[PDB]
Every structure is written in structure tokens, then in C-alpha cells.
Amino acid sequence: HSQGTFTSDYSKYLDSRRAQDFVQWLMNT
Amino acid sequence: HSQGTFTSDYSKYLDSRRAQDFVQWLMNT
Amino acid sequence: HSQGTFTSDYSKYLDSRRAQDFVQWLMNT
Amino acid sequence: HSQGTFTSDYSKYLDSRRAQDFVQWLMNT
Amino acid sequence: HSQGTFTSDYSKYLDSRRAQDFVQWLMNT
Amino acid sequence: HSQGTFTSDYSKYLDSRRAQDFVQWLMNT
Amino acid sequence: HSQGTFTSDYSKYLDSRRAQDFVQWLMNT
Amino acid sequence: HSQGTFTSDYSKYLDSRRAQDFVQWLMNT
Amino acid sequence: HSQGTFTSDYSKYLDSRRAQDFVQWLMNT
Amino acid sequence: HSQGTFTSDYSKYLDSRRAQDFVQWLMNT
Amino acid sequence: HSQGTFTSDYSKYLDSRRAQDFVQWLMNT
Amino acid sequence: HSQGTFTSDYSKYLDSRRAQDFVQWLMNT
Amino acid sequence: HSQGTFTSDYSKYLDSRRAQDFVQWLMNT
Amino acid sequence: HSQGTFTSDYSKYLDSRRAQDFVQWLMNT
Amino acid sequence: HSQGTFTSDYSKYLDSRRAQDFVQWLMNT
Amino acid sequence: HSQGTFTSDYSKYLDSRRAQDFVQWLMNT
Numbered sequence: 519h520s521q522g523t524f525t526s527d528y529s530k531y532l533d534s535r536r537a538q539d540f541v542q543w544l545m546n547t
Numbered sequence: 548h549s550q551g552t553f554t555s556d557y558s559k560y561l562d563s564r565r566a567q568d569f570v571q572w573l574m575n576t
Numbered sequence: 577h578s579q580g581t582f583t584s585d586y587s588k589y590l591d592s593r594r595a596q597d598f599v600q601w602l603m604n605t
Numbered sequence: 606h607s608q609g610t611f612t613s614d615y616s617k618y619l620d621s622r623r624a625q626d627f628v629q630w631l632m633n634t
Numbered sequence: 635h636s637q638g639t640f641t642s643d644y645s646k647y648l649d650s651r652r653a654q655d656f657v658q659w660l661m662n663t
Numbered sequence: 664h665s666q667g668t669f670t671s672d673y674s675k676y677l678d679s680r681r682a683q684d685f686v687q688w689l690m691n692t
Numbered sequence: 693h694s695q696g697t698f699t700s701d702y703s704k705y706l707d708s709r710r711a712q713d714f715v716q717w718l719m720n721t
Numbered sequence: 722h723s724q725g726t727f728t729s730d731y732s733k734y735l736d737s738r739r740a741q742d743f744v745q746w747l748m749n750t
Numbered sequence: 751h752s753q754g755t756f757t758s759d760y761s762k763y764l765d766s767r768r769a770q771d772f773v774q775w776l777m778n779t
Numbered sequence: 780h781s782q783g784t785f786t787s788d789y790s791k792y793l794d795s796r797r798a799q800d801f802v803q804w805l806m807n808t
Numbered sequence: 809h810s811q812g813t814f815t816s817d818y819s820k821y822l823d824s825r826r827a828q829d830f831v832q833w834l835m836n837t
Numbered sequence: 838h839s840q841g842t843f844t845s846d847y848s849k850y851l852d853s854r855r856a857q858d859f860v861q862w863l864m865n866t
Numbered sequence: 867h868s869q870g871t872f873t874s875d876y877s878k879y880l881d882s883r884r885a886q887d888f889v890q891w892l893m894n895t
Numbered sequence: 896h897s898q899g900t901f902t903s904d905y906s907k908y909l910d911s912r913r914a915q916d917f918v919q920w921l922m923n924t
Numbered sequence: 925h926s927q928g929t930f931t932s933d934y935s936k937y938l939d940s941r942r943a944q945d946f947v948q949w950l951m952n953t
Numbered sequence: 954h955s956q957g958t959f960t961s962d963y964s965k966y967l968d969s970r971r972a973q974d975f976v977q978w979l980m981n982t
Contacts, residue, residue: 519576519721520897521720524949526571527570530710531566531711532565533564533707534562534563534705534706534708534911535561536703537557538557538559539557539703540700540703542919544696545551555599558877561594565589567587568587568887569584571583572582574580574893579633580632580633580893581632583629583630584629584845585626586628587625589624594855595615597614597615598613598615599614600612604811608778616653619651622647622825624646627642629640631638636691637691640687643685644683644684646683649677650794653675656671674790682798696749697747698744698746701742701744702741702744704741704742705738706739710733710734711731713905713945714730715729715730716727717727718726719724725957731945741973751837754805754807754834754835755805755833756832757833759802759829759830761798762826763796763826764796764826765795765796766792767792767823770789770818770819771789773817774785775815777782777810777812778781778811779781810864810865812862815859821853822852823854825851827848828847830845833843835841842890842892844890845890846888847885847887854880855878855879857877857878858875861871863869872919873920875917876916883908883911884908886905887906888902890901891899891901893897893898894897896955897952898951899950901949904945907942908942909940914936927980928981929977929978935971936971937969937971938971946962948958951956952957953955
């Protein structure tokens with residue numbers, strides 16, 4: 519004989535990024 | 548009588564995940 | 577004898593992308 | 606008396622997934 | 635003798651695309 | 664006393680799929 | 693009668709995660 | 722026969738990143 | 751005053767794998 | 780005054796998806 | 809008076825996603 | 838005044854892995 | 867009067883994410 | 896004037912790891 | 925009259941995050 | 954003139970580690 523309200527909200531944000539750059543330069547004379 | 552070697556390697560990766568949940572409960576009479 | 581209302585919503589979004597670029601160059605003389 | 610060797614490789618992949626679910630229940634009398 | 639109504643829907647969308655391009659050239663003299 | 668080689672390769676594929684399910688039912692008297 | 697070697701390697705990574713949850717419960721006759 | 726309300730919220734933010742860069746250069750004559 | 755039981759579940763399983771291998775060799779005399 | 784070049788490329792992809800939904804409801808008194 | 813250039817590239821990707829949801833509702837008195 | 842029982846559970850599992858290996862070999866004489 | 871260059875690059879990545887949610891609602895008197 | 900119970904639980908597990916290994920070997924005579 | 929260069933680079937990363945939240949609300953006269 | 958109980962608990966565990974090892978060895982004769 520009563521009124522009840524329940525509001526639940528969940529939010530998740532995961533952002534992961536990586537970058538790898540490698541180079542080689544050899545000169546022989 | 549010479550030798551040159553040049554190499555380059557670039558690799559990158561990006562990952563993004565997002566989750567959301569909503570729950571609402573109402574009781575009355 | 578009572579009135580009840582339940583509303584639940586779930587949303588999920590996943591975005592994953594990868595990019596890799598590599599090259600080589602050798603010159604001999 | 607010379608030689609040149611060049612090469613290039615580029616690869617990219619994109620994956621995106623999205624899911625959604627809705628649930629509603631109503632009781633009365 | 636009660637009245638009840640339930641409505642639920644689920645949507646799923648997947649999209650996967652990949653592109654690979656590589657070339658090489660050599661010149662001898 | 665000379666030569667030349669050239670090789671190029673390119674391939675790309677795109678696969679997408681979409682699904683939707685709906686379920687609803689109501690009972691009364 | 694000479695030799696030179698030049699190499700470079702750089703790698704960076706960034707990870708950021710955020711979590712948010714909201715909840716509210718009310719009861720009254 | 723009274724009224725009561727309860728509000729709760731939780732938020733968290735985690736940001737961590739790292740960058741490493743190293744190179745080598747050798748010259749011989 | 752009636753008894754009602756409802757049970758609904760959805761299961762989805764996706765498996766996508768790709769393998770690419772390319773090689774080349776050249777001999778000059 | 781001769782040479783020989785050989786290039787071989789092989790790529791295979793396998794994508795599979797399976798979905799199963801179960802829904803049952805019973806009412807009595 | 810000879811020169812040989814060989815290269816090999818092998819890439820493989822495996823992605824497996826599985827989702828499951830269970831919902832049960834029982835009303836009586 | 839009525840007895841009601843609601844049970845909802847959601848489970849999701851995603852496993853993605855990638856492997857790339859490339860090598861090269863050049864001989865001059 | 868000879869020169870040989872051998873390079874090797876192997877990179878792997880593994881990602882595993884699992885989510886679980888439990889909700890139980892009971893009303894009586 | 897009624898009895899009601901609501902149990903909610905959320906669990907999330909994310910495990911991601913990557914490994915990159917590269918080596919180079921050059922010999923000149 | 926010889927020169928050899930051998931370099932090695934290995935990098936590994938491990939990230940594991942676990943979230944657990946429990947909530948239970950009851951009301952009765 | 955009724956009784957009400959509200960229990961809530963939040964727990965989070967974040968474990969992230971990284972390992973980088975690189976070496977270089979050059980020999981000239």
C-alpha cells in the first residue's frame with residue numbers, strides 16, 4: 519500500500535591505445 | 548666499396564570500449 | 577493485488593582497430 | 606656493380622561491435 | 635485474473651573489414 | 664648486365680552482419 | 693675504412709579509464 | 722507512512738601514460 | 751491470484767580468424 | 780649472366796558465427 | 809658475383825566473443 | 838499483497854589476440 | 867668480399883575482458 | 896506495509912597484455 | 925676485416941583491473 | 954513505524970605492470 523521508486527544507472531568507458539615506431543640506418547663506405 | 552641499409556617499422560593499435568546499463572524499478576498500488 | 581512496472585535497458589559498444597605499416601630499402605653500389 | 610631492393614607492407618584492421626537489449630515488465634489487476 | 639505485458643528487443647550489429655597492400659621493386663645494372 | 668623486378672599485391676575484404684530480435688507478449692482477462 | 697651505425701627506437705603508451713555509477717532509491721506511502 | 726530518499730553516486734577516473742625513447746649512434750673511421 | 755513463470759535467454763558466439771603468409775626469393779649470377 | 784626470382788603468397792580466412800535464443804513461459808493457478 | 813634476397817612475413821589474428829543473458833520472472837500469491 | 842521473484846543475469850566474454858612475424862635475409866657476393 | 871643482413875621482428879598481443887551482472891528483486895507481504 | 900528485497904551486483908574483469916621482440920644481425924666481410 | 929652488430933629489444937606490459945559492487949535494499953513494517 | 958535496511962559495498966582493484974629490456978652488442982675486427 520505504498521509507492522517506491524528505484525533508479526540505477528551504470529556507465530563505463532575504457533580507451534587504451536599504443537604506438538611503436540622503430541627504424542635502422544646503416545651506411546658503410 | 549660501399550653498402551647502405553635503411554629499414555623502418557611503425558606499428559600502432561587503439562582499443563576503446565564503452566558500456567552502459569540502466570535499470571528503473573517502480574512499485575505502487 | 578498491486579501495480580508494478582519494471583524497465584531495464586542494457587547497451588554495449590566495442591570498437592577495436594589496428595594499423596601496422598613497415599617498409600625496407602637497401603641500396604648497394 | 607650495384608643493386609637496390611625496396612619493399613613496403615601496410616595492414617590495417619577495424620572491428621566494431623554494438624549490442625543493445627531492452628526489458629520491460631508491467632503487472633496489474 | 636491479472637493483466638501483464640512484456641516487451642523486449644535485442645539488436646546486434648557487427649562490421650569487420652581488413653585491407654592489406656604490399657609491393658616491392660628491384661633494379662640491377 | 665642489368666635487370667628489373669616489380670611485384671605488387673593488394674587485397675581488401677569487408678564483412679558485416681546485422682541481427683535484430685523482438686519478443687513481446689501480453690496476457691489479460 | 694669507416695663504419696657508422698645509427699638506430700632509433702621510440703615507444704609510447706597511454707591508458708585512461710573512467711567509471712561512473714549513479715544510484716537513487718526512494719520510498720514513501 | 723513516511724517518506725524516505727537515498728541518493729548515491731560513484732565516479733572514478735584513472736589516467737596513466739608512459740613514453741620511452743632511446744637511440745644509438747656509432748661512428749668509426 | 752495466479753502463478754506465472756517466464757524464462758528467456760540469448761546466447762551468441764562469434765569466431766573469426768585469418769592467416770596470411772607471403773614470401774619471395776631472388777638469385778642473381 | 781643469369782638470375783631467378785620466385786614469389787609465393789598464401790592467405791586464408793575463416794569466419795564463423797553461432798546464435799541461440801531460448802524463451803519459455805508457463806502460467807497456472 | 810652473386811646476390812640473394814629472401815623475405816618472410818606471417819600474420820595471424822584470432823578473435824572470439826561470447827555473450828549470455830538469463831532472465832527469470834515469477835509472479836504468484 | 839503478492840509474491841514476485843525476478844532474476845536477471847548478464848555475462849559477456851571477449852577474447853582477441855593477434856600475432857605478426859616477419860623476417861628478411863640478404864646475401865651479397 | 868661478402869655481406870649478410872638478418873633481421874627478426876615478433877610482436878604479440880592478448881586482450882581478455884569479462885563482464886557479469888546480478889539482479890534479484892523480490893516483493894511480498 | 897509490505898516486504899521487498901532487491902539485490903544488485905556488478906563484476907568486471909579486463910586483462911590486456913602485449914609483447915614486442917625484435918632483433919637485427921648484420922655481418923660484413 | 926670484419927664487423928658484427930647484434931641488438932636486442934624486448935618490452936612487455938600487463939594490465940589487470942577488477943571492479944566489484946554490491947547493493948541490497950530491504951523495507952518492511 | 955516500519956523497518957528498512959540498506960547495504961552497499963564498492964570494491965575496485967587495479968594492477969598494471971610493465972617490463973622493458975634492451976641491449977646492444979657490436980664487435981669490429
